[PDB]
Amino acid sequence: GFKIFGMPLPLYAFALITLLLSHFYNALPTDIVGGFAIMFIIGAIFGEIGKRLPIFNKYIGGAPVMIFLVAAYFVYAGIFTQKEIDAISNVMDKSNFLNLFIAVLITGAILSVNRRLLLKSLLGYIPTILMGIVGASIFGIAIGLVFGIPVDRIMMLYVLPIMGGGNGAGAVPLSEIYHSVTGRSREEYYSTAIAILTIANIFAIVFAAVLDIIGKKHTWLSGEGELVRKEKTGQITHRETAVGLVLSTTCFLLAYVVAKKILPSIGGVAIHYFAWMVLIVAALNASGLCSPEIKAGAKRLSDFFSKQLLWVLMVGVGVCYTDLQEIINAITFANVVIAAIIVIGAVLGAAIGGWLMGFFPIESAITAGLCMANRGGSGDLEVLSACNRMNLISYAQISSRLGGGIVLVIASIVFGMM
Amino acid sequence: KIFGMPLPLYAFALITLLLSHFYNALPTDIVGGFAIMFIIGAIFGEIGKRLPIFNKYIGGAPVMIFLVAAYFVYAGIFTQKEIDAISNVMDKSNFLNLFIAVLITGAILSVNRRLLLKSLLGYIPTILMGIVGASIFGIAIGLVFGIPVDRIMMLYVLPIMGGGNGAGAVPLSEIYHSVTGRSREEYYSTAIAILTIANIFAIVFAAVLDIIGKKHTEKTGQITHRETAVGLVLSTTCFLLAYVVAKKILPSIGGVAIHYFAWMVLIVAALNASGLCSPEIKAGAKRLSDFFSKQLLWVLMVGVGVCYTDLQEIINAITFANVVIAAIIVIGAVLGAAIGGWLMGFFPIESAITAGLCMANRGGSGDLEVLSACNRMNLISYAQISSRLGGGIVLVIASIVFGMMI
Numbered sequence: 001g002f003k004i005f006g007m008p009l010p011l012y013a014f015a016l017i018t019l020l021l022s023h024f025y026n027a028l029p030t031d032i033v034g035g036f037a038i039m040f041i042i043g044a045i046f047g048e049i050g051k052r053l054p055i056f057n058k059y060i061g062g063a064p065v066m067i068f069l070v071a072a073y074f075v076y077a078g079i080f081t082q083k084e085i086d087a088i089s090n091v092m093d094k095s096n097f098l099n100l101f102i103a104v105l106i107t108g109a110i111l112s113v114n115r116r117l118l119l120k121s122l123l124g125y126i127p128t129i130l131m132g133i134v135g136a137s138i139f140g141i142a143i144g145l146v147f148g149i150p151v152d153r154i155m156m157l158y159v160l161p162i163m164g165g166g167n168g169a170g171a172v173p174l175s176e177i178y179h180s181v182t183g184r185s186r187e188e189y190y191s192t193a194i195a196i197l198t199i200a201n202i203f204a205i206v207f208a209a210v211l212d213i214i215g216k217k218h219t220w221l222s223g224e225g226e227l228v229r230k231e232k233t234g235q236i237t238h239r240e241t242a243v244g245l246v247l248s249t250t251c252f253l254l255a256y257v258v259a260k261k262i263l264p265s266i267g268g269v270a271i272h273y274f275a276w277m278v279l280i281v282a283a284l285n286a287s288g289l290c291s292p293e294i295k296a297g298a299k300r301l302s303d304f305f306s307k308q309l310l311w312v313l314m315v316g317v318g319v320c321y322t323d324l325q326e327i328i329n330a331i332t333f334a335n336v337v338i339a340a341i342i343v344i345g346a347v348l349g350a351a352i353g354g355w356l357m358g359f360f361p362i363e364s365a366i367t368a369g370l371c372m373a374n375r376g377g378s379g380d381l382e383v384l385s386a387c388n389r390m391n392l393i394s395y396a397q398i399s400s401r402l403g404g405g406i407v408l409v410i411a412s413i414v415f416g417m418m
Numbered sequence: 419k420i421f422g423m424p425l426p427l428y429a430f431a432l433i434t435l436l437l438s439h440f441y442n443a444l445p446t447d448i449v450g451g452f453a454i455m456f457i458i459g460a461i462f463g464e465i466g467k468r469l470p471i472f473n474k475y476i477g478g479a480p481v482m483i484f485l486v487a488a489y490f491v492y493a494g495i496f497t498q499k500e501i502d503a504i505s506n507v508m509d510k511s512n513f514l515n516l517f518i519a520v521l522i523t524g525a526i527l528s529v530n531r532r533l534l535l536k537s538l539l540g541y542i543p544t545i546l547m548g549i550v551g552a553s554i555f556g557i558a559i560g561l562v563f564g565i566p567v568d569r570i571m572m573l574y575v576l577p578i579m580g581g582g583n584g585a586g587a588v589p590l591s592e593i594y595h596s597v598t599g600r601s602r603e604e605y606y607s608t609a610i611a612i613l614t615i616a617n618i619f620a621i622v623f624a625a626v627l628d629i630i631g632k633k634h635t636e637k638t639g640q641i642t643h644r645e646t647a648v649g650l651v652l653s654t655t656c657f658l659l660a661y662v663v664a665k666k667i668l669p670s671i672g673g674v675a676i677h678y679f680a681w682m683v684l685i686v687a688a689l690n691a692s693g694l695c696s697p698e699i700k701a702g703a704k705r706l707s708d709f710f711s712k713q714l715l716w717v718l719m720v721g722v723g724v725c726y727t728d729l730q731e732i733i734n735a736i737t738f739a740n741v742v743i744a745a746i747i748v749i750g751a752v753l754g755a756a757i758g759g760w761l762m763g764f765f766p767i768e769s770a771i772t773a774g775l776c777m778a779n780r781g782g783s784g785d786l787e788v789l790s791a792c793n794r795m796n797l798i799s800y801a802q803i804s805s806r807l808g809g810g811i812v813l814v815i816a817s818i819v820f821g822m823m824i
């Protein structure tokens with residue numbers, strides 16, 4: 001009766017048996033039901049394992065990472081069946097659980113805070129991001145020349161893609177800007193960019209847990225899950241929580257309709273729909289259209305995802321947004337080192353910047369540093385789960401989305417300069 | 419407030435819906451889907467909830483959304499994209515099964531180990547007796563109207579005895595499509611219509627049996643999200659096992675093919691009796707089922723009205739023939755459960771209400787409608803055994819019936 005996943009070993013065995021029956025008989029619906037079934041079980045076991053591996057389990061960050069890495073190794077080693085990969089992929093992409101997840105988090109995180117606090121951060125945050133970029137560039141250029149690599153490459157094939165807001169946000173559009181300005185094939189760029197950015201993404205998740213340990217070892221640096229130094233609710237029901245779900249989706253829809261047809265770009269920046277959402281939700285908070293009861297509902301919902309479904313999510317993240325074969329194709333000692341150091345440049349860059357802006361250095365280096373250099377949205381979840389600061393999702397998204405859009409403007413200029 | 423959202427807030431959402439609508443910008447995925455489904459379901463849910471005649475016997479809040487939604491597809495009110503988004507949630511993502519899976523699990527695990535085991539020996543047989551009587555009378559009156567027996571079982575008997583909209587119409591269409599291959603909407607539209615007619619007769623005879631009756635005289639506390647989350651694990655994992663069983667291990671017990679949902683009922687029921695789940699977890703599954711049945715039910719109907727309903731066919735099968743056939747099947751259940759219960763040691767009137775009318779009624783909403791018509795509201799617990807477990811039994815029987823026919 002020693003529990004796995006709040007399920008006693010006997011009960012878990014029943015499920016683990018079922019998983020294996022589906023696995024060996026090759027019978028599985030490639031849908032939500034089939035997906036969650038597998039994801040829950042697989043996540044559960046490796047979650048616990050990673051939670052209790054001695055060296056491997058350090059801080060809180062051991063459990064989310066295990067599932068993620070393990071799951072990727074299952075795809076790479078072909079342990080998953082094609083139908084299983086399809087089922088998981090169907091939940092993450094075709095059904096689009098990923099966005100929902102982030103949407104729920106953002107909504108719940110923003111609707112919990114006071115209206116007075118809101119605008120106070122945003123003004124000091126963006127500069128911190130730029131500080132992180134400077135540091136990411138300064139260190140990149142520095143290490144580039146150590147390896148005898150021209151600076152242009154460092155900015156175009158190393159720095160910019162890493163800091164860029166992920167696969168869809170950076171690799172996809174940075175190859176577009178590359179082709180528009182150079183004329184050389186997108187694949188030539190993308191293939192190198194996507195590969196290297198994923199390497200850095202793995203370092204980002206590692207250093208996230210390292211900064212966690214350094215934060216709890218040197219309390220002066222850490223805010224213990226809070227970036228800024230600095231109505232009570234009645235009883236809650238399912239309906240309030242359910243309303244949280246309505247608001248989570250409907251806010252994403254509005255943001256989507258805005259970024260597609262109404263206000264696709266404010267200026268030189270194209271605003272990614274998630275960025276709009278943050279502004280919409282924040283606006284919705286200040287408008288106070290949501291009563292405290294409902295505002296809690298959104299929080300409560302966010303908890304259910306971030307604490308129950310987080311393990312599930314990682315199984316999906318390790319499958320879809322981590323091609324271990326493309327990494328291998330660019331694991332020359334050189335890239336591994338260059339990439340890692342650029343991340344460290346972002347860490348120190350955002351640490352110093354935030355410290356100057358009034359935020360806690362550890363949190364600043366995570367939100368404005370590692371969350372830039374990670375693989376955008378999928379990455380943010382991977383990083384924030386490694387340092388147990390999942391409540392900063394909203395900030396992480398500002399860097400990955402708005403900060404990613406900034407990378408594009410900078411990129412265009414860099415490309416033009418050559 | 420609309421759907422627990424104050425009118426100002428709901429407006430914000432309703433505005434957004436219309437922006438997505440007019441601008442034709444909508445992700446054809448879960449997020450986009452639920453966004454629309456929540457909002458649309460919310461308004462028409464309230465509308466159908468406020469309507470006087472319609473709420474009490476027409477099914478009300480759910481029926482509004484499911485009919486309205488169908489009219490939106492038929493009248494082309496929805497955009498291709500919007501239909502795609504909703505369909506993407508219901509089929510490609512397969513929310514429908516998850517929904518049913520969660521319900522089944524929560525409904526079966528909520529029955530106490532003793533209640534379940536004890537109920538099987540006496541109450542459960544009475545239910546089966548009611549079904550026999552419901553079938554025998556149905557078949558009998560079918561031929562009187564020159565109706566083939568297969569129709570009597572598939573389009574009349576089974577759907578009536580099946581517990582409700584979510585529990586019978588929704589999954590019986592699923593089993594119908596999985597075994598015949600014909601559209602769900604063809605079945606659903608006829609089934610949902612007939613079953614509601616019978617539901618109205620059930621509430622009438624409940625008051626008639628009341629007059630005839632008077633004329634002829636371990637419960638745990640600390641449930642957390644994890645427990646509820648475990649409910650979700652068990653809901654899916656139990657469906658997976660059932661799926662693996664139907665597809666390779668035991669696709670058919672004999673010449674008859676057991677549909678995976680039927681297996682699930684047996685698996686979950688087994689899991690209950692095995693007591694592998696502690697009361698805390700067993701509640702978690704219940705709580706989950708509540709969240710779906712009470713929050714996401716409105717959403718579900720928006721989806722059901724889009725994919726699972728054709729208006730012409732459904733409008734057409736409103737024939738006086740149905741009125742009579744349906745009523746008599748109910749009477750067959752009454753006499754079936756009356757005789758059975760009398761043989762089992764229960765009072766015939768009470769047996770015919772709980773194991774008879776509560777089967778033929780519209781699942782849970784129905785039980786409340788029936789038990790309030792005969793003042794026997796204290797038998798809610800029994801009524802729900804019929805609507806939930808007995809409904810799950812109807813599914814196993816239904817698979818066998820379908821297989822035998824084809």
Ligand SMILES: CCCCCCCCO[C@@H]1O[C@H](CO)[C@@H](O)[C@H](O)[C@H]1O
Pocket residue numbers: 109110113118119121122226227228278282391392393394395
């Ligand atoms: C104008 C800027 C609007 C977006 C602000 C996003 C930050 C709100 O985010 C919230 O802030 C809290 C206070 O730091 C944290 O405790 C919460 O975990 C975090 O989610």
Ligand code: NA
Pocket residue numbers: 161162163164165166170197372373374375376
């Ligand atoms: Na990045």
Ligand code: NA
Pocket residue numbers: 577578579580581582776777778779780781
């Ligand atoms: Na019924």
